[PDB]
Design a protein around this ligand. Structure first.
Ligand code: CLA
Ligand code: CLA
Ligand code: CLA
Ligand code: CLA
Ligand code: CLA
Ligand code: CLA
Ligand code: CLA
Ligand code: CLA
Ligand code: CLA
Ligand SMILES: CC1=C(C/C=C(\C)CCC[C@H](C)CCC[C@@H](C)CCCC(C)C)C(=O)c2ccccc2C1=O
Ligand code: SF4
Ligand code: SF4
Lengths: 31, 95, 30, 733, 81, 154
């Protein structure tokens, strides 16, 4: 609801934090 | 057994047939005719060919072979040297 | 820190795709 | 109803989905689509495949980059015993904890998949060794593969010319290439192997520091320029060698001497270099053959023109084949394809029996999934070769400009050409098939005797006039002596081309009636495959049923019913139809090696002998014997050794089968229920208003002949991919 | 082209010969002498789909038409819906 | 003689084939026909593949390993009629299939409406143009290449 130019922001942001820490982990619990 | 220098003698038989014309008439490259820039139409698809120009030195520079190829091959390349040898030079008969 | 080189399969096999399946929906429109 | 796709126009405002697909498959068809000029086009393929070379180095870079920090090398260069090298680390969150089970392979830590490409024995086989000494690869190749793009642009920018007419010379180029390129491209290679590699092979290292200080000898290039060459080849290598570490090394580059070794098969150190040298005169002597302004040599017409060997007095012309191979660009990309196609197999059929690498066959896997990615392709070419030489005939070509002229007459006297082709096949058909059912009716029937089985005489024959010093046999003038060579002897054919029978790796395997069939069934392939490609080609122009089949020639797939009933009668759909037999030859052939090899390794050879002379058995032992390993690899009893492969192998059987739809479906049925199935949405709540931007349709009437195929193919080619590997890996053999 | 498939012949007479084909072909345009004197190959073709019902009947003695149009609307394929 | 081994006069591997394999044909100690008059493995089927003893004729016949016999036919040592003898035979028989193909065909295209006389058959097999084939001495080997089917008609 300030949508006035966005979405590009939420697709680096949100999707670099559903995947940055989301894949990494400090002591596996492996594949 | 092998005349190895039978044929390196032999191949610079022919490319001295290359020492040719850098010298004798006019410029380079029968001066770039057509190379860069692109002869129209005639570079077009084509030209030239001439079954008639296999002469000129057939007779003269067919000697070029026997040059290096004689006295400068199996007969110890230029023994008549000396011309500044001290930062070294020699040069010395491996033969 | 210990044992952590896992980002070049989502950024590629996952997120790079996001970009283009989004982005390249430029074929539809832009 | 808007406007989009930025090159075509009919495609651009087509309201359906065709809009999309047909966009992503007209891209590369420059010659004639909106945006084009003979000036545009040429350059629009030029800075295209400068976009090439470019993608080949981002490939190679990473090939040398999943290797240098893991993926054994300061291992496998300690001694390369047939236990599981490495490509790269497999990493998928779907993996079970049997991440621990093989899949995870010995030396390295996390799971991996090992080099079945050769790279691993040529990054090594030209020296390139130490794991502190090694980590270059991308670093260069890539500080290269970017330049590959720079011209792309630089030569795309008008100003500093992208060159237009200059694209139809020849003479100048190819008077340049087969000297400048190849010749010095050799040479310079001859350079490298020799200063930096041969030393790295038999002898010792080369240190990143010195390059002057290192001298293959004590007293330099010595004579050499002194025409005296010979005394390279004396005590060059040895045999009590220990490959890579001198000691019985000796140091005199070049030879033809010594030969095979239980410690490495592979062409000798030197020879791949006097050769690389040796040929590098001929091309350099060859380069410098045509004009390029100065005023010597040749015009590429005037030695066609009225050249002609059996022409002269046989009323059969030769007019400007130049301004039609030159004004064609398809003739071009199809004499290009083939040569490559013929030599892609000459590469890959010589790459065995003569592999030039430190440990390869005596590897026997990488050796068998590398003859074929060079048999697939190669076959895969040939077709495309034959397929851009039936486009020349339609888009380009020019009956009034080629006539009485020997490219015509080829058209004109064509009905014969396919017939005396088809007569080969039908003969090569039932006659192979008599011999193979008969051979299979007789077994089963209890009589292994009665079996029809011709020795491959003219085969083994070629070889008892070589080195196949198999169990004696004279031959009138030869005997095994009296006359031997006389003119030849202790020079040339020394220990080499003297592998003989060598049950292990003799080069030539000892051929019998099992081979007098496959060898006539690879022959029934490229013949049938080509009656269709020769035909496909020999009238993309038209014929009786469709006389005026043109202005578009190639892919017009389909025509109305009536006349006789007319169908896959575009030169594409014969190409389309061709690719099945290029996928059936390039199967019988590859199929053949392996069964042979397999058997000729960790076991017998009698096996292929009395059990390839028939057909059932080709299915039973091979096909049915030798899958074993893989399939009980998902096993009700946990994931064992291989699992990628067998899942691939059933991914193999699906992608295949699911071709068929596309192939027995034909747009009509599909479109129509989509007519009913697009009465849904429109008539159903919580999914109304909701507009498509592309109108739901069923695939084009050419498109699906493709997609079933480009589907038929992967399945098929992804099945053997997984098959052979999944069985040449335990083996046994 | 945009619909360009040649059914032409030489008689272009249309009695017990050919009529079939959704809208596309409002001919009978007598060229000053061709026997039953009605001629050519089409009228305004920017209307209908891509049949070869076009020949199937009454000669084209050469080819006969089919799909070749490429540039292809929607009203030109039943399905723009 | 050539690549495989020698004929029947000796061929060890071949011998073993004769014996095990067939004779296990045996394999049925009895299986009742002590006197009985049907079940004929017993008599021939063996003996017809079998009394084919250390004789089969004698044929030469090369026999490789496993001793299944291979066919050279290069016209030498013994083996000539494993292709030519039954080769010219294939030629002669065919060609007198199609010599008459080009005959109960070139005899029709004439008279009055001749437009499918061929779905029925005028003289069955041709039984008129029949022997034209054995009644080929020379024949097409001249008259094909000179006249009739003459380059004209080419
Ligand atoms: C569609 C397929 C394609 C693919 C994916 C491959 C893949 C492969 N091929 Mg291959 N090949 C193909 C088509 C393909 N090929 C075709 C069509 C042919 C026939 C022409 C071949 C003939 C072929 C041969 C003979 C071999 C391979 C080999 C290989 C393997 C080696 C890796 C490699 O290629 O690095 C490629 C490396 C480069 C591109 C860089 C090297 C190029 C050098 C020569 C450039 C020299 C330029 C130099 C700078 C100029 C010097 C001038 C100055 C310094 C004086 C790899 C598996 C090799 C193998 O067997 O592995 C075991 C080898 O045997 N291929
Ligand atoms: C080395 C290459 C060579 C070159 C330089 C060209 C160049 C060209 N070809 Mg061509 N071709 C070649 C080899 C080559 N070809 C071979 C070997 C074959 C068959 C053996 C063909 C069969 C072929 C056909 C049928 C046609 C061309 C056409 C063309 C022209 C347009 C290109 C195009 O349509 O692609 C655009 C394609 C795409 C953008 C991608 C769609 C391709 C699909 C089928 C994917 C293929 C399978 C794929 C690898 C599987 C999916 C991957 C999977 C792992 C998911 C262009 C002049 C066209 C033409 O202009 O002729 C009139 C067309 O008719 N070619
Ligand atoms: C295994 C398969 C099957 C068979 C038997 C054939 C056979 C043939 N294909 Mg073919 N084909 C196939 C699958 C098959 N195809 C598939 C899947 C495709 C791709 C979808 C193609 C695509 C293709 C193309 C493009 C062409 C062929 C051609 C041919 C013919 C080539 C000449 C030849 O090889 O010898 C002759 C035939 C054989 C050896 C097969 C046996 C035929 C005889 C022996 C029948 C047996 C008689 C029997 C006792 C009587 C039973 C009948 C009844 C009375 C009970 C041949 C008839 C070409 C052609 O037309 O050549 C002129 C060429 O056009 N094929
Ligand atoms: C192995 C086969 C292949 C597949 C997958 C299909 C699938 C289908 N065919 Mg079919 N068909 C085939 C070969 C195939 N066919 C062949 C060879 C022929 C003739 C020779 C036909 C003749 C035919 C006819 C006449 C009809 C069909 C119909 C159908 C549809 C039936 C409804 C259905 O259950 O689909 C959905 C289910 C599947 C396709 C199977 C599951 C697929 C798995 C692998 C799941 C993958 C999904 C997952 C999200 C993947 C995404 C991952 C990402 C990496 C992409 C279905 C799409 C009919 C139809 O349209 O009715 C609805 C119609 O009756 N077919
Ligand atoms: C119910 C069936 C099913 C189906 C539909 C298939 C289908 C297929 N299998 Mg398959 N398979 C099956 C069950 C099935 N399999 C089972 C139960 C097993 C045992 C686990 C296998 C083991 C298997 C293996 C090991 C292979 C396949 C391959 C294939 C593919 C061959 C592709 C082709 O077009 O022909 C190509 C077929 C041939 C060229 C001939 C194979 C048939 C053999 C018996 C004869 C050899 C040809 C002969 C010697 C030369 C011609 C003689 C002639 C000139 C007279 C095909 C997709 C192969 C593949 O990857 O395809 C490339 C691979 O070889 N299968
Ligand atoms: C009387 C017979 C006749 C003759 C003289 C020929 C002759 C020829 N045919 Mg042919 N053909 C025939 C009948 C005949 N055919 C029939 C009935 C068919 C089935 C449609 C074909 C299908 C065929 C094909 C696909 C091809 C040929 C080709 C050829 C040529 C190559 C020969 C070859 O290798 O094929 C061997 C012959 C056959 C496969 C034909 C089988 C039919 C024979 C057995 C007919 C037997 C007589 C028959 C019963 C007539 C009744 C007798 C009557 C007097 C009462 C050659 C000119 C090839 C060509 O064009 O290259 C020049 C091409 O490959 N033929
Ligand atoms: C095109 C090439 C080639 C290929 C087929 C691959 C393939 C792969 N690389 Mg890789 N890589 C390459 C060149 C290549 N690489 C180069 C030149 C570098 C040095 C910059 C790397 C540095 C690299 C790292 C650090 C990693 C991979 C990883 C991987 C794997 C996961 C995909 C990924 O995220 O890559 C990432 C790729 C890059 C960072 C390189 C970007 C360079 C551009 C120019 C290439 C884009 C080309 C594209 C096809 C268009 C996959 C097997 C990942 C892995 O180990 O998982 C198993 C790991 O993340 N690569
Ligand atoms: C294209 C053909 C091919 C050829 C050249 C042969 C040739 C032969 N077959 Mg044969 N066969 C074939 C295909 C062929 N077959 C096929 C496809 C089948 C399966 C239907 C068979 C099933 C078969 C059987 C069951 C038998 C033969 C037998 C024979 C031999 C007997 C001929 C004879 O009695 O001459 C005598 C007269 C003259 C020479 C005149 C002969 C060597 C017979 C045999 O004795 O085994 C070798 C045996 O009856 N064949
Ligand atoms: C298939 C073959 C054909 C081809 C490609 C060749 C090729 C070759 N022959 Mg050759 N040759 C052939 C038929 C062929 N021959 C025949 C039919 C005869 C019988 C007279 C010979 C008798 C012959 C002799 C005596 C020699 C060659 C030699 C050679 C090599 C000459 C290069 C050289 O060392 O000087 C070259 C590889 C020479 C060689 O280098 O072999 C040791 C020489 O020894 N050939
Ligand atoms: C199923 C089927 C259809 C229907 C069309 C369908 C089913 C299209 C369905 C789309 C699928 C689900 C897309 C999945 C493909 C993915 C791999 C994505 C493709 C990405 C590309 C850009 C490469 C036809 O139109 C047709 C036409 C002519 C002959 C045979 C057939 C036929 O068999
Ligand atoms: S009937 Fe067919 S002119 Fe005759 S072929 Fe042309 S439309 Fe009428
Ligand atoms: S042939 Fe074409 S123009 Fe004629 S009716 Fe059919 S679609 Fe219309």
């Amino acid at each position: 609801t300030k949508r006035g130019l966005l979405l590009k922001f939420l697709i680096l942001g949100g999707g670099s934090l559903l995947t940055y820490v989301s894949a990494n982990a400090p002591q596996d619990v492996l594949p | 057994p092998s005349l190895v220098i039978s044929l390196s003698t032999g191949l610079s038989l022919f490319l001295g047939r290359f020492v040719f014309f850098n010298f004798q008439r006019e410029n380079m490259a029968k001066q770039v005719p057509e190379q860069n820039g692109m002869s129209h139409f005639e570079a077009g698809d084509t030209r030239a060919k001439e079954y008639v120009s296999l002469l000129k030195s057939n007779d003269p520079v067919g000697f070029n072979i026997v040059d290096v190829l004689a006295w400068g091959s199996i007969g110890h390349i230029v023994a008549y040297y000396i011309l500044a040898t001290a930062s070294n030079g020699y040069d010395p008969s491996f033969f | 820190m210990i044992n952590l080189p896992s980002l070049f399969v989502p950024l590629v096999g996952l997120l790079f795709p996001a970009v283009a399946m989004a982005s390249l929906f430029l074929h539809v429109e832009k | 109803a808007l406007r989009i796709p930025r090159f075509s126009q009919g495609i651009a405002q087509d309201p359906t989905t065709r809009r999309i697909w047909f966009g992503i498959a007209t891209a590369h068809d420059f010659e004639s689509h909106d945006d084009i000029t003979e000036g545009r086009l040429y350059q629009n393929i030029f800075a295209s495949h400068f976009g090439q070379l470019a993608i080949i180095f981002l490939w190679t870079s990473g090939n040398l980059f999943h290797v240098a920090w893991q993926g054994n090398f300061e291992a496998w260069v300690q001694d390369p015993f047939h236990v599981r090298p490495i490509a790269h680390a497999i990493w998928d969150p779907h993996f079970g904890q049997p991440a621990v089970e093989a899949f995870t392979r010995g030396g390295a830590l996390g799971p991996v998949n090992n080099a079945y490409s050769g790279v691993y024995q040529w990054w090594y086989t030209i020296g390139l060794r130490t794991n502190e000494d090694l980590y270059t690869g991308a670093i260069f190749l890539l500080f290269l593969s970017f330049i590959s793009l720079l011209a792309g642009w630089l030569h795309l920018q008008p100003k500093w010319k992208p060159s237009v007419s200059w694209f139809k010379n020849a003479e100048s180029r190819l008077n340049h290439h087969l000297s400048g390129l190849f010749g010095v491209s050799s040479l310079a290679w001859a350079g490298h192997l020799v200063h930096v590699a041969i030393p790295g092979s038999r002898g010792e290292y080369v240190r990143w520091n010195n390059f002057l200080d290192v001298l293959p000898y004590p007293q330099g290039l010595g004579p050499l320029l002194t025409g005296q060459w010979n005394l390279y080849a004396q005590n060059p290598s040895s045999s009590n060698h220990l490959f890579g570490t001198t000691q019985g090394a000796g140091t005199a580059i070049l030879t033809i001497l010594g030969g095979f070794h239980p410690q490495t098969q592979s062409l000798w150190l030197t020879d791949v270099a006097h050769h690389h040298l040796a040929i590098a005169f001929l091309f350099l002597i060859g380069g410098l053959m045509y004009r390029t302004n100065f005023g010597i040599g040749h015009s590429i017409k005037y030695i066609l023109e009225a050249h002609i060997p059996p022409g002269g007095r046989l009323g059969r012309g030769h007019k400007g084949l130049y301004d039609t191979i030159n004004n064609s660009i398809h003739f071009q990309l199809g004499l290009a394809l083939a040569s490559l196609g013929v030599i892609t197999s000459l590469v890959a059929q010589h790459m065995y029996s003569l592999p030039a690498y430190a440990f390869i066959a005596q590897d026997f896997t990488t050796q068998a999934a590398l003859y074929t990615h060079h048999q697939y392709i190669a076959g895969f070419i040939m077709t495309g070769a034959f397929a851009h030489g039936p486009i020349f005939f339609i888009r380009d070509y020019n009956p009034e400009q080629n006539a009485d002229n020997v490219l015509a007459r080829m058209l004109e006297h064509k009905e014969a050409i396919i017939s005396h082709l088809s007569w080969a096949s039908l003969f090569l058909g039932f006659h192979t098939l008599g011999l193979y059912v008969h051979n299979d009716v007789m077994l089963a029937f209890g009589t292994p005797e009665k079996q029809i089985l011709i020795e491959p005489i003219f085969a083994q024959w070629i070889q008892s006039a070589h080195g196949k010093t198999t169990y004696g046999f004279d031959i009138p003038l030869s005997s095994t002596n009296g006359p031997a060579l006389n003119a030849g002897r202790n020079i040339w054919l020394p220990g080499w081309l003297n592998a003989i029978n060598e049950n292990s790796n003799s080069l030539f395997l000892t051929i019998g009636p099992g081979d007098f069939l496959v060898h006539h069934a690879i022959a029934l392939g490229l013949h049938t495959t080509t009656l269709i490609l020769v035909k496909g080609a020999l009238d993309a122009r038209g014929s009786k049923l469709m006389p005026d089949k043109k202005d578009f020639g190639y892919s017009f797939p389909c025509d109305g019913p009536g006349r006789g009933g007319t169908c896959d009668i575009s030169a594409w759909d014969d190409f389309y139809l061709a690719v099945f037999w290029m996928l059936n030859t390039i199967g019988w052939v590859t199929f053949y090696w392996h069964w042979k090899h397999i058997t000729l390794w960790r076991g017998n050879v009698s096996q292929f002998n009395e059990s390839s002379t028939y057909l059932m058995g080709w299915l039973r032992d091979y096909l049915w014997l030798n899958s074993s390993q893989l399939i009980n690899g998902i096993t009700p009893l946990v994931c064992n050794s291989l699992s990628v492969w067998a899942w691939m192998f059933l991914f193999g059987h699906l992608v295949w089968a699911t071709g068929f739809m596309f192939l027995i479906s034909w747009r009509g049925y599909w479109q129509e229920l989509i007519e009913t199935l697009a009465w849904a949405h429109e008539r159903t709540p919580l999914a109304n208003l909701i507009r498509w931007r592309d109108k739901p349709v069923a695939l084009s009437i050419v498109q699906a002949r493709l997609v079933g195929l480009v589907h038929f193919s992967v399945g098929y080619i992804f099945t053997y991919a997984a098959f052979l590997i999944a069985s040449t890996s335990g083996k046994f053999g | 082209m945009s619909h360009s498939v040649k059914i032409y012949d030489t008689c272009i007479g249309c009695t017990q010969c050919v009529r079939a084909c959704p809208t596309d072909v409002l001919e009978m345009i007598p060229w000053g002498g061709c026997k039953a004197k009605q001629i050519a190959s089409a009228p305004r073709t920017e209307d209908c789909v891509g049949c070869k019902r076009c020949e199937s009947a009454c000669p084209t003695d050469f080819l006969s038409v089919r799909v070749y149009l490429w540039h292809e609307t929607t009203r030109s394929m039943g399905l723009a819906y | 003689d050539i690549a495989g081994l020698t004929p029947c006069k000796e061929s060890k591997q071949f011998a073993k084939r004769e014996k095990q394999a067939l004779k296990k044909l045996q394999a049925s100690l009895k299986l009742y026909a002590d006197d009985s008059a049907p079940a004929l493995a017993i008599k021939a089927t063996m003996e017809k593949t079998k009394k084919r003893f250390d004789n089969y004729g004698k044929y030469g016949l090369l026999c490789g390993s496993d001793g299944l016999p291979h066919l050279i036919v290069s016209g030498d040592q013994r083996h000539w009629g494993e292709f030519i003898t039954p080769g010219i035979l294939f030629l002669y028989i065919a060609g007198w299939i199609g010599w008459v193909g080009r005959s109960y065909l070139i005899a029709i295209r004439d008279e009055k409406k001749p437009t499918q006389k061929e779905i029925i058959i005028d003289v069955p097999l041709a039984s008129s143009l029949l022997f034209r084939g054995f009644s080929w001495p020379v024949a097409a080997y001249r008259e094909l290449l000179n006249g009739e089917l003459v380059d004209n008609n080419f």
